[PDB]
């Protein structure tokens, strides 16, 4: 037992922490949208992703290949605009996670366009482990990238992806796997000499427009809090996308509705009609859109040039 | 098509902005406190370096009531209506703003408690002091306690006449910070209550 004054002090500070964290109210600003964990520690990046074009170019010039991680629901809006603007000489492998919910037709269209451009699209499901993904990445490296000059050197892949998409989870999984096998970078397979290099700030989007935030909250990337962004702004956009699709009978069959709804108020009242208030009803609708019982959905549009 | 469901949410919110700016013309004049008024005249001379203007200091508090349409709006709106949350939140915000303007007055006003449901006349500043949670209202409370200690420390016998059981009981009845029946600090503006009942 240490000093009693120190015991009293730690008791007092723990009680203060408890009385500070007892409040269930969540603050407006999404801390997750700006925090980004790395090897040095938790970092907060400010600014958009356009003013970092040369900082991205100087690193994609050093890296051997470009491993990007995006979400299949909204491919283009999650990533880097300068990567799509300026052509990257290095081969790119784009892993679309949560591919079970995206439109199969849009998935084949985007993978066809990536094959036409020179990139390789890999769609990963929840049942698939990261081992098959990293094995396919190794196969891509040994099939596309040329042989290194010196035998001891390794090929580097710059990882571009938001921490909500699964980049941080993949990094942690590979790190723990390597640590358990042996007991700023991350080695995956030592026989082909493949290593990965992460860039937190270049992938952290930071600020976003209204519709961008709507799409991110509908996909589950950005958090949702009552002070900053009510559920109405996102659920009405979801229903507007569903109405632009025009599948009213399909909405009814999915939500177990007596008839095809006419308006958003009608949708809310019909979901309310188990009994629950409109707020939790809209929360359950958004949760349905998150879990993905509604399938073959793509919120991000495709430009004319990518559709050609 | 277009953003029908999005524009409908924006249209209803624009209506709430207009019907609440309309209710501003229905006001109830409340004369400010004597000590608080001199505190605004003092802070104005140091800020603007000029004598205070009778139209800027506003010795009469302009409190705004909730619009007559809004109370009957949430009334006939079913709980299953999605548009009830956006108008309920609009009323909860105005219900607190009304408290913020009410605490600046010191004239006698009807205040009922919610514990034993007793209606009594109280002064809004001293009654709603613990609920409003304003630092300037906290700093003036600490300032007046020192001002009383300065007078009592200069003359100890001054406490005998000023602070007596006859004087202390009289001042508590003059500023009923709690209900004389249930002794509860929780209270409500009766004017806002009767405005909500006869319309709902």
């Amino acid at each position: 037992v240490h000093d009693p004054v120190f015991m009293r002090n730690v008791k007092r500070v723990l009680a203060s922490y408890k009385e500070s964290m007892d409040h269930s109210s969540r603050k407006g600003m999404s801390r997750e949208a700006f925090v980004d964990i790395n090897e040095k520690g938790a970092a907060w990046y400010l600014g958009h992703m356009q003013l970092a074009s040369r900082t991205l170019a100087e690193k994609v010039k050093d890296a051997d290949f470009v491993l990007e991680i995006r979400d299949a629901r909204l491919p283009f809006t999650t990533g880097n605009p300068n990567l799509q603007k300026i052509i990257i000489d290095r081969p790119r492998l784009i892993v679309f996670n949560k591919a079970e919910m995206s439109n199969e037709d849009c998935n084949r269209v985007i993978q066809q366009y990536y094959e036409r451009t020179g990139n390789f699209a890999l769609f990963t499901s929840a049942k698939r482990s990261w081992r098959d993904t990293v094995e396919a990445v190794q196969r891509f490296v040994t099939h596309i990238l040329p042989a290194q000059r010196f035998k001891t050197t390794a090929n580097v892949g710059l990882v571009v992806g938001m921490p909500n998409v699964g980049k941080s989870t993949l990094i942690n999984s590979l790190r723990l796997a390597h640590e358990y096998q042996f007991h700023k970078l991350v080695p995956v397979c030592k026989d082909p000499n493949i290593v990965l290099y992460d860039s937190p700030g270049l992938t952290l989007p930071g600020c976003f427009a209204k519709e961008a935030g709507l799409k991110l909250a509908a996909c589950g990337i950005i958090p949702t809090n009552d002070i900053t962004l009510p559920r109405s702004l996102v659920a009405r956009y979801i229903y507007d996308v569903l109405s632009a699709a025009g599948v009213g009978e399909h909405m009814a069959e999915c939500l177990h509705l007596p008839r095809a709804p006419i308006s958003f108020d009608d949708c809310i009242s019909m979901i309310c009609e188990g009994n629950l208030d409109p707020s939790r009803a809209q929360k359950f609708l958004i949760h349905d859109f998150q879990l993905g019982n509604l399938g073959r959905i793509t919120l991000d549009k495709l430009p004319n040039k990518v559709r050609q | 098509p277009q953003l029908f469901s999005i524009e409908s949410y924006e249209t209803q919110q624009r209506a709430l902005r207009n019907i609440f700016n309309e209710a501003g013309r229905h006001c109830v004049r409340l004369r400010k406190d004597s000590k608080w008024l001199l505190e605004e005249r003092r802070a104005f001379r140091q800020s603007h370096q000029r004598a205070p203007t009778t139209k800027e200091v506003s010795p009469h508090v302009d409190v705004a009531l909730a619009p007559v349409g809004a109370l009957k709006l949430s009334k006939y709106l079913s709980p299953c209506s999605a548009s009830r949350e956006v108008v309920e939140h609009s009323l909860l915000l105005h219900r607190t703003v009304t408290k913020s303007k009410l605490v600046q007055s010191s004239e006698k006003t009807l205040f009922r408690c919610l514990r034993c449901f007793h209606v009594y006349a109280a002064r809004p500043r001293t009654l709603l002091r613990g609920e409003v949670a304003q630092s300037w209202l906290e700093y003036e409370a600490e300032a007046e306690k020192e001002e009383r200690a300065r007078q009592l420390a200069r003359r100890p016998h001054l406490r005998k006449k000023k602070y007596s059981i006859g004087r202390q009981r009289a001042s508590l009845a003059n500023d009923p910070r709690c209900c004389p029946l249930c002794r509860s600090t929780k209270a409500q503006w009766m004017m806002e209550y009767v405005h909500h009942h006869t319309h709902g």
Binding site: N103, E211, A244, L294, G295, R296, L302 | P1, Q2
Partner: peptide, 30 residues
Amino acid sequence: PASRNIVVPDAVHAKVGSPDTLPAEILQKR
């Protein structure tokens, strides 16, 4: 309900050059 056709047209919403497409920073600066 999983493989049902749900396609979204590009002319219904999210027009190019809109205050919703542009972030609030640029609009406030302008």
